[PDB]
């Protein structure tokens, strides 16, 4: 946690430039952004910062995964900007670059109290060190441009903030690769660690971890160490392909499939015998003949496959009953990733009906926590921000600290 390193609350801004890491990494939809919990989030920090006399707060994130390549028709970050400005009360300067000579003559010296919101940092194959170029070839950044991006954003501020907690589990440039002499956790990031601290130290049991989503490569990778933590866990959402098709043998069609994951999805399975961990998958299925809102739909079964061509979207009635028995018996719960495709109304059901009982487990004492910028967007579509234990900003951040790991934009912040 933060009990050794430096935070804003003891942070003198006093007359000084604050560059601060934020997650306003917010879900989309129709080139709208479909909920700003995010940037909300990250307000308390902000108007912190303001009101202890800042002479600006510069803030970065990234925006979705543009891989490297500048992206501003669909990945920029000019509406949270203006979302921004009315959460705060005060106007937002956005700037269409995060580096740079003209990022760094606005931000030299801003009349006091200026507030800027810099471009997309992963535009720039240097914020994650690796990316696509525009023809959609891998490519890797060079070490020296690597520094010199770095180096330029350290320019923008006197004093680093990192508010990121959605990012934490990321060692990209700007979360770990600013050099700055004072480097502080902001109250977004002190109240998320605090709360699963306290809430990971003896964990009410039955423990269940729902993983759902749709970030496959990336979260298969975690479930090694969640093993030794939880007692069950439902896989589904997008996960649950690459488990069904080793396992079972399923015809998946198009559905999400992830061939490093593959490899280890026995050995998974091995462990969770091993530690005594139910594993539940879906059984039964809604499908899609293409990846569209008003895609024709049909239904499938683990027995019956997917039909090639198509791809399965959401779980269906005898897979949420099985969620619904897990639901259940656990005492405490974190879900990260929606079982469906919750924002297209086609495929939300299994989701619905899965958040219909995380709500009245609450209401009977289980511990419930949800994360993640889209599992998030669920608790605000479905009215049920209120109505569980804790709605965090990190998912894949969230699911790190289950495993036991320190994050890296912790890591890199000052030592008290
Ligand atoms: N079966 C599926 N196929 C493809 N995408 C899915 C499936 N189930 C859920 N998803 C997607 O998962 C996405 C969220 O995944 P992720 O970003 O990992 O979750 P979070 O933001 O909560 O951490 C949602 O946008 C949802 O559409
Ligand atoms: O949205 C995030 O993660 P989530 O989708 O796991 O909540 C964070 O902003 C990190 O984004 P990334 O997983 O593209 O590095
Ligand atoms: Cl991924
Ligand atoms: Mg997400
Ligand atoms: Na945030």
């Known amino acids: 946690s933060l009990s050794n ?19 306003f990494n917010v879900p989309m939809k129709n080139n709208q952004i479909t909920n700003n919990q995010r940037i909300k989030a990250a307000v308390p920090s902000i108007k912190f910062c303001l009101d202890n006399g800042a002479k600006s707060v510069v803030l970065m994130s990234h925006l979705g995964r543009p891989d490297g390549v500048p ?4 990945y920029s970050l000019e509406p949270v900007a203006v979302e921004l400005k009315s959460l705060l009360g005060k106007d937002v300067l956005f700037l269409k670059d995060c580096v740079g000579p003209e990022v760094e003559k606005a931000c030299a010296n801003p009349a006091a109290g200026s507030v800027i919101l810099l471009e997309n940092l992963r ?26 991006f770095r180096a330029s954003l350290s320019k923008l501020g006197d004093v680093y903030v990192n508010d990121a907690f959605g ?4 060692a990209h440039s700007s979360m770990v690769g600013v050099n700055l002499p004072q480097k502080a956790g902001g109250f977004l990031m002190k109240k998320e660690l605090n709360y699963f601290a306290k809430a990971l130290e003896s964990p009410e049991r039955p423990f269940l971890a729902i993983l759902g989503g749709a970030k496959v490569a990336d979260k298969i990778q ?5 093993l030794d933590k939880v007692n069950e866990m439902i896989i589904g959402g997008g996960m649950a392909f690459t488990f069904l098709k080793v396992l079972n043998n399923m015809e998946i069609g198009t559905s999400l499939f992830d061939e490093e ?7 998974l399975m091995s462990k969770a015998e091993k530690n005594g961990v139910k594993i539940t998958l ?23 496959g997917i039909p090639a061509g198509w791809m399965g979207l959401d779980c269906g009635p005898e897979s949420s009953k099985k969620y619904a028995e897990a639901v259940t018996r656990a005492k405490q719960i974190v879900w990260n990733g929606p079982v469906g495709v919750f924002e297209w109304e086609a495929f939300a059901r299994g989701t619905k009906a899965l958040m219909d009982e995380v709500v009245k487990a609450t209401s009977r004492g289980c511990i419930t926590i949800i994360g993640g910028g889209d599992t998030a967007t669920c608790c605000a579509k479905w009215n049920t921000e209120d109505k569980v234990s804790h709605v965090s900003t990190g998912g894949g951040a969230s699911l790190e600290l289950l495993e036991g790991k320190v994050l890296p934009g912790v890591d890199a912040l000052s030592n008290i």
């Open 5 to 23: 390193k430096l935070t804003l609350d003891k942070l003198d801004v006093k007359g000084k430039r604050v560059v601060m890491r934020v997650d």
């Open 71 to 74: 992206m501003p028709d669909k």
């Open 123 to 148: 535009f720039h194959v240097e914020e994650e060190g690796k990316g696509k170029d525009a023809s959609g070839n891998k490519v890797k950044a060079e070490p020296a441009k690597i520094e010199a």
């Open 167 to 170: 990012t934490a589990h990321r």
């Open 222 to 226: 975690l479930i090694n160490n969640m």
């Open 261 to 267: 994951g593959a490899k280890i999805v026995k050995d």
């Open 282 to 304: 879906p059984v039964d299925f809604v499908t899609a003949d293409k990846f569209d809102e008003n895609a024709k739909t049909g239904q499938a079964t683990v027995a019956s």
